[PDB]
Structure formats: C-alpha cells, structure tokens
Write an enzyme that holds these catalytic residues in place. Structure first.
Site, mmCIF file in Angstrom:
data_model
loop_
_atom_site.group_PDB
_atom_site.id
_atom_site.type_symbol
_atom_site.label_atom_id
_atom_site.label_comp_id
_atom_site.label_asym_id
_atom_site.label_seq_id
_atom_site.Cartn_x
_atom_site.Cartn_y
_atom_site.Cartn_z
ATOM 1 N N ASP A 1 43.001 38.649 44.407
ATOM 2 C CA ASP A 1 44.019 37.635 44.663
ATOM 3 C C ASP A 1 44.644 37.753 46.066
ATOM 4 O O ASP A 1 44.489 38.774 46.754
ATOM 5 C CB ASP A 1 45.098 37.740 43.584
ATOM 6 C CG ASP A 1 45.718 36.399 43.214
ATOM 7 O OD1 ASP A 1 45.633 35.427 43.998
ATOM 8 O OD2 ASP A 1 46.314 36.328 42.122
ATOM 9 N N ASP B 1 46.111 27.027 40.627
ATOM 10 C CA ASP B 1 45.867 27.511 39.273
ATOM 11 C C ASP B 1 45.838 26.377 38.264
ATOM 12 O O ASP B 1 46.712 25.505 38.253
ATOM 13 C CB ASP B 1 46.969 28.491 38.862
ATOM 14 C CG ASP B 1 46.935 29.799 39.648
ATOM 15 O OD1 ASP B 1 46.059 29.991 40.531
ATOM 16 O OD2 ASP B 1 47.807 30.647 39.367
#
Ligand SMILES: *[C@@H]1O[C@H](CO)[C@@H](O[C@@H]2O[C@H](CO)[C@@H](O[C@@H]3O[C@H](CO)[C@@H](O)[C@H](O)[C@@H]3O)[C@H](O)[C@H]2NC(C)=O)[C@H](O)[C@H]1NC(C)=O
Ligand SMILES: *[C@@H]1O[C@H](CO)[C@@H](O[C@@H]2O[C@H](CO)[C@@H](O[C@@H]3O[C@H](CO)[C@@H](O)[C@H](O)[C@@H]3O)[C@H](O)[C@H]2NC(C)=O)[C@H](O)[C@H]1NC(C)=O
Ligand SMILES: *[C@@H]1O[C@H](CO[C@@H]2O[C@@H](C)[C@@H](O)[C@@H](O)[C@@H]2O)[C@@H](O)[C@H](O)[C@H]1NC(C)=O
Ligand SMILES: *[C@@H]1O[C@H](CO)[C@@H](O)[C@H](O)[C@H]1NC(C)=O
Ligand SMILES: *[C@@H]1O[C@H](CO)[C@@H](O)[C@H](O)[C@H]1NC(C)=O
Ligand SMILES: *[C@@H]1O[C@H](CO)[C@@H](O)[C@H](O)[C@H]1NC(C)=O
Ligand SMILES: OC[C@H]1O[C@@H](O)[C@H](O)[C@@H](O)[C@H]1O
Lengths: 391, 390
Positions: free
Chosen positions: B139, B200
């Site tokens: 990430d 997301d």
C-alpha cells in the site's frame, strides 16, 4: 380528503416505474402500455395472492391516451393499444374483484405529452366516472402558474365529488409547488387522499436513500398532517425489479410501513422472484402499514451511519426500524434502551419484541429498564414490533 | 513483472472489504482480524470448491501487525490475534494446497496506522520470504513524496526478487501518484505483477460504476500495458455481500472478466448464497478472465445508456459484454451488427455465439451480415462468447 376513502393507505399496482411510456407494441409487445398488459396483470393479482394480501387497485399511469380528444372533447384510450376502451377494461377489472386507477394531468399536457385536463376538469372527471374508474392520479406537468396549479387540483377534487362516484384522488400538488413556494399541507389534505412530495422513484438504492433523507429532513412539516383519508406519498414500491439488493428491498418495505405510505407496486407480476413476492405479501409488515390508528412514523435518531425510525400503532404497540447506512464491511451491532423507544410508553412496564425483518423471530420480553441489542446488514433494515404488556 | 508469476490474473480471497480493521475479538471473535478467521476461510476454500475453481491465494490485508516491530526490527503479527505467527499460518495454508498473501506499506505507516516499511524494505522482504509468504499487497499511505513512492516500490520489488522466493507483487503505486502526476505504466509493469489504479471499492453499485467509468475513460493509457505477469487491478470482487442486486453482481463478474482483472473475493465464505457462489465459480466466465493470451478488454461503444465492451481471446474467440446503465423501467432491447464486433474479424464469414450471463444459452450461428439482438436488465450485463467458424 373527506370522501370516506383511503382510511388506510391505498394498496395496489401502478405501471409507471417498470413499464413507463413504452408505445412500441410491435417490437416490444410484452412491455408496451396496452389493455392486454393490464388484463394479464389483473389475472395474476388474483391468482398469485396479491388481492388477498390487500393489493386492490390496478392503476394505469401516463401514456394510455389517444393523441387527441374525440369530436365531443372527451378523452379517448389509444385505439391500437386499448381497442376495447377503458369502460370494458374497468368491467374486466371489477369482475376480478379489483379496482381501476387511471391517470390525468392538471396542465395542458400530461408529462409524456398527451391531452391535459385544464379546461376539461368537469368533463374529464365525469367520463372517468362513466368508465367506472375508482382512482385518479393527477399529475402537474405543463402548468407554470402557481395559481392554475392550486385551482386545478381543487377544481378536479370537486369535479370528481360531483359525479357521486367514489374515486380515490391521488395528487402531485406538493411536488410541483416546491419550485415556487413551500406547500400548505392542511389545504392539500382537504382536497386529496394522498400526495406526492418528492421526485419520481427509480430502480436504485440512491433513489430510496434520497426519498428517505428528504422525508426525515422535512418530517416536522409532513408527519402530523398524515392520517385516515390523507397520506404522504413517497412513490412506488420497486421491489421485484433489478436495481435493489435483497437488503435494500427490505429497507424499502420496512420504511414504507413506518411512513404510512400508499403501497403501489411497480413491477412485473409475471416475472417476480418467490423472495420478492414473500416480502411484498408479508402479512405482519403490511399490517403495520395498514394500522387503523393511521399515525405516520418518523426518524427518532441518526448518527454513526445508523438510523432509528418508529411508528405508533393502535393498542400501545410500536414498529421500530433500524437502518445501517454504512455501505462497506459487514453487519454492525446497534444497541438501544427500550425506554428510548415509543416515547417511553412501548415497554412500560414491559414489551414483547418480535423481529419482522429481515426474518421473523420472537425476541421475547423486555423490561422498561432493559436494552435491545441487534445487528444490521449494510443498506439493510431491522424491523421490530413492540407489544406493550404487563406480563 | 518478469518473475514467472501472475501469467493469468491472480485469483483468491482478500479480507479487506468485508472484514476491514476489526480488532474487537472480545465482542466479535468470529469477524475480527485473526488467525482463526483465515483458518476458517482456508478450510472453506478447499471444501466448498473455491480452490477447484482457481481461487488459490488466501490474503491478509491491513491490521494483522502488532503495534511495533520486535527487538530485531522485524514486523510481527499481533500476539493475541495471530498467536502462532505468520510462518505457522503459511504452513497451515500450504498444507491445504493454498497460497498465503500478506500486506505492507511503502510509507512510514500502513493506512490503518501500523508499522510502515519505509527504511525496512530489505528486512521486510526477507521476513516475508522466511515466513513462506506467497503474495504481497504493498500500500501507498503515509508517503510524503512522489520520489519516495517510486523508489520504495522499485526497492521492495528488487528486494523480494533477491529473497529467491516466488512472491506475487501487488502495487498501489499508480493510485497514489495519480492525484499529482500521470503514472508511467511501462515502468510500473516492470516492477509489479498487478497495480491498483482507482479508489477502494465498497459494497455499492455506485462504486462499480465509478470504477468502470474510470477504466473506460482512461483506457487508451492502461489497456495495452496489461498482459501475462502484469495486470490492471480494479479492486476486489464484492459479490456475496449486501449492497449489490443480482444484476449488479452479474455486471461485476462479467466486466472483471472483460478487464482481465485479478479476482480477489472479499466476502464471508461461511455465509454466502448458492446464487452468489455459482456466479463466482462460473467456469466459462472464469475461463474468459483467465484466457492465456492475457489481452485486456476495452469499451467499444457507449450511447443511449448502453455500453459495449469486448475482449480478444485465444484461438480467434472474443468475449462481448453489454451493460444496461438505465436505472428505470424493464429489460431493454439492444442490437449491434456482428461485423462491428471483434474488429470485424470475430464473425467473418461467421461466428457461433453463446450467452454466458445472466444465464448460459447457445444463440447459434451469426453470418457476417447478421445483427446481435438482446434484452438487458437495468444495471445488468449480457456476456457472450463468439467463436469464429473458420
Ligand atoms: C363529496 O364531498 C362531501 C363533503 O366532504 C362528502 O361527504 C362526506 O362524507 C363523509 C364520509 O362518507 C362523512 O364523514 C363521516 O363518515 C363517518 C363514517 O365512519 C361517520 O361516522 C360520520 O358521521 C360522518 O358522516 C361526512 O359527513 C360527509 N361530509 C358532509 C359535509 O356531508 C362526500 O362523500 C363526497 N363524495 C361523494 C361520494 O359524494
Ligand atoms: C528476479 O528477476 C529475474 C530477472 O528479471 C527473473 O528472471 C526471469 O524469470 C523468468 C521466469 O522464470 C524468465 O522467463 C522464462 O525464460 C525461459 C527461457 O529459458 C522460458 O523457458 C520461460 O518460459 C520463461 O519465459 C526470464 O527470462 C528471467 N529473466 C531474466 C532476464 O533472466 C527471476 O525470476 C526473478 N526471481 C524471483 C524469485 O522473482
Ligand atoms: C518517514 O518519516 C521521516 C521522518 O518524519 C519526520 O518526523 C515525523 C514524526 C513527521 O513529523 C514528519 O513531518 C517529519 O518529516 C521522513 O524523513 C521520511 O520522509 C518519511 N518517509 C516517507 C516515505 O513518508
Ligand atoms: C393552456 O393553454 C391556454 C391557451 O393556450 C393558456 O391560456 C393556459 O395558460 C394553459 N393552461 C395552463 C394551466 O398552463
Ligand atoms: C393553509 O390552508 C388552510 C386551509 O385552506 C388555512 O386554514 C391556513 O390558514 C393555511 N395556512 C397558512 C399558514 O397559510
Ligand atoms: C516510462 O518508463 C519506461 C521504463 O522505465 C521508460 O523506458 C520510458 O522512458 C518512460 N517513458 C516516459 C514517457 O517517461
Ligand atoms: O415529527 C415528530 C418527530 O420530530 C422529530 O424531529 C423528533 O426527533 C422526534 O422525536 C419526533 O417527535
């Protein structure tokens, strides 16, 4: 409206959301707005338990009319799509023990562009009564004057009254007022059996949300005006179609019950899942919507992507709806003191709580001091019924 | 990434969307992020035919870590929630014939606030390999500069290679630089097995549309770079959860196949409807996603609230998806000349057409002169396979 009708919110089927203005009977025969569609829908209303559940009114929305009025200035059904006329369609619908709804517009044209009722209120109302019409949905398109709007809705109300025919009067009056000024709901109630407040529903969760948020935001203005003979209309039930998840369907059914909403399904009764059917025909949920007290419910609480709604029912009973508005993750726990529910009356000194949605489950006895703990699916609703008891 | 991995888009399960960062094992022991959760999923992946269908990677996302590194400066799993450690969990997962994915961050902290890997890329890479980790999702949170972002992604890529272990490398590189700079996809591909491009996903149809719309708008930049060993990642499959209608779930499954997307389910394998399971396990649809040619599909057409997407497949076949974006009314008729499909070669001189979604149905032979006629549900997709007749 003091016409003796809509003492509980009207229940039925309306074609608009699912079928709209499909005029193409050659290339889309199963979808086009035709007398065959309404006949077939009437057959399934009887044979598939809809009438038994309380869905009484088979309703035609926009796009039933011939392009022009006849030589007498009366409205006509389309000759190609409704070759046998509204008269014989009403006869057919009544023989099945059902009632017939129709559609007209206060302005010069309907929203879809077919003949409007301005200048014909008395003629139009009489021809509906002659045809055996049992409900009128009166739209507000092509009327840009605030005065004309009010005068038309008031005129048509009395025009229907003078026929001596019992016709449920469904108005879009408040919705078409908002562009000009805030509606006087006391006045609208005097003339209408129910009234559309907000934009047309569509087949989406976005749409359900926007209707709920408008209602809760404006509730201090609309809740207390609702009652036997006059209801707020948040638009059609769209359960059984394509755009709602199971949980979103549960949310709509539960909340339309809380809101004392007219229950007009707009779906295809020929192609509907057993699950959607069971939800729409749910005895206990329909019983909440149809409660004889006729007190509309409201939003009690909001915060942390949760909503709590409640509705007072007859006999010191209450319906409580808990919505989970977080659209990520899994089921979330929500806890509340039962003393906070039903203005502290529902569970004093006790209540028996029964979950109705998403599944029916007896939760047992709750003391006034006790806490109700529940889990709610993302975009879902938990609907509970509270029964006041000494036990 | 030329590591001999992700030759077809990676398939598995990833905890994030459904389970998030739930640390409450006291009140919610069955849904908190724990060793137990991953054991339960691993068992169901085998016993419920997920592994048989191709779902091979059982993946941990954020919130597995202890608040701090150990006394040796290594990342460690939470001692209460992962009492046996990651190496032991990987042992278990391997014994089930599955692979273990894990999660780290290029910056100073993960997105949920646990230890980042900045300054520890070689230690962390070696730690992962030692644990028997098979995939890393890396990430981009808490990275203060674009230079540090690029350097970190390159660094970890090379560091994983030097361990000698086959580890699938999942990057969020392009997502975190998009606000500031246009990504170099040739460069990202050189370092990553797949890459997150867009925000997301969550449990909503709104979200699916945003992702689809972003992808079709950016397709000139992203479609051609995708292929064996390097894929665009439009995020997790959310089928089996709460926010999508049946037709919206069909749209996600069909379009993730068109897009040659990695298929990481994020759902509860313990509580999943037979309908959702059958869709996610659809052999014919998975086969399109997994086509060895690895050529990403693209939007061909858009108008009157319809979209047409197509994907070239091995052996002169094509996949075609038709979405109905109108969210009112009923099943809506759409027609297209088959000569317009597959660059004019799919059905010259003819093709056999098979509908795969919403249901499997042979449509028959279509001449080059023919038109494909279809009714598509609001928010649904019709997915077809075209075989050229020779
Ligand atoms: C035309 O308008 C008049 C005036 O509003 C309507 O007459 C009204 O009818 C209602 C119900 O039929 C009457 O209200 C009450 O009904 C209950 C039944 O439970 C009864 O207990 C009460 O004693 C009372 O009658 C109301 O009195 C009456 N209003 C007046 C001023 O006469 C009429 O129904 C409308 N439409 C028709 C069908 O003509
Ligand atoms: C670390 O990086 C190196 C170099 O990028 C990787 O080596 C590459 O490995 C792949 C697959 O193992 C090689 O492709 C294969 O080549 C043979 C030709 O003999 C062919 O038979 C296979 O079908 C396949 O195409 C690739 O050539 C090779 N690259 C180089 C430049 O040597 C290595 O795999 C990485 N190691 C790890 C542990 O990730
Ligand atoms: C990681 O952090 C390093 C030091 O950060 C400094 O101290 C912290 C507490 C913050 O207040 C920050 O503003 C200071 O710069 C940085 O030198 C380094 O660039 C950071 N690495 C990344 C990739 O973000
Ligand atoms: C309908 O048309 C007439 C004459 O063209 C016009 O005077 C009137 O304003 C219109 N009616 C309404 C209610 O908009
Ligand atoms: C609303 O209309 C009703 C009935 O016409 C009337 O009694 C009342 O004065 C109106 N309210 C306001 C504040 O204008
Ligand atoms: C993109 O990256 C590749 C590999 O690093 C490089 O060859 C190329 O010069 C770059 N192109 C641009 C537009 O910067
Ligand atoms: O419409 C009546 C309602 O008004 C709300 O604003 C209030 O929060 C509720 O307690 C309820 O009384």
């Amino acid at each position: 409206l003091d016409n003796g009708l809509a003492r509980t919110p009207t229940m039925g089927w309306l074609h608009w959301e699912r079928f709209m203005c499909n005029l193409d009977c050659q290339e889309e025969p199963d979808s086009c707005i035709s007398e065959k569609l309404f006949m077939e829908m009437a057959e399934l209303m009887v044979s598939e338990g809809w009438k038994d559940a309380g869905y009484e009114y088979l309703c035609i929305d926009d796009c039933w009319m011939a392009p022009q009025r006849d030589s007498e200035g009366r409205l006509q059904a389309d000759p190609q799509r409704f070759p046998h006329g509204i008269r014989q369609l009403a006869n057919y619908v009544h023989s099945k023990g059902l009632k017939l709804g129709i559609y007209a517009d206060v302005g010069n044209k309907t929203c879809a562009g077919f003949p409007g009722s301005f200048g014909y209120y008395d003629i139009d109302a009489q021809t509906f009564a002659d045809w055996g019409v049992d409900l009128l949905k009166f739209d507000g398109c092509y009327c840009d004057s605030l005065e004309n709007l009010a005068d038309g809705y008031k005129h048509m109300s009395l025009a229907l009254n003078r026929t001596g025919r019992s016709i449920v009067y469904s108005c879009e009056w408040p919705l078409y007022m908002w562009p000009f000024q805030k509606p006087n709901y006391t006045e609208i109630r005097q003339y209408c059996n129910h009234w559309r407040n907000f934009a047309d529903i569509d087949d989406s969760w976005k749409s359900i949300k926007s209707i709920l948020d408008w209602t809760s935001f404006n509730q201090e203005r609309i809740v207390d005006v609702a009652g036997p003979g006059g209801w707020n209309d948040p638009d059609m039930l769209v359960i059984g179609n394509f755009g709602l998840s199971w949980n979103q369907q549960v949310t709509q059914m539960a909340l339309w019950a809380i809101m004392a909403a007219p229950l007009f399904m707009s779906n295809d009764l020929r192609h509907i899942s057993p699950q959607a059917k069971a939800l729409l025909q749910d005895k206990d949920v329909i019983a909440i919507n149809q409660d004889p007290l006729g007190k509309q419910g409201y939003q009690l609480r909001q915060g942390d992507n949760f909503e709590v709604w409640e509705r007072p029912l007859s006999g010191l009973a209450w319906a409580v709806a808990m919505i989970n508005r977080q659209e990520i993750g899994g089921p979330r726990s929500y806890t509340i003191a039962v003393a906070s529910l039903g203005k502290g009356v529902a569970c004093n000194p006790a209540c028996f709580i029964t979950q109705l949605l998403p599944v029916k489950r007896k939760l047992g006895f709750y003391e006034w001091t006790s806490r109700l703990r529940s889990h709610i699916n993302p975009t879902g609703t938990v609907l509970l019924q509270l029964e006041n008891t000494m036990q």
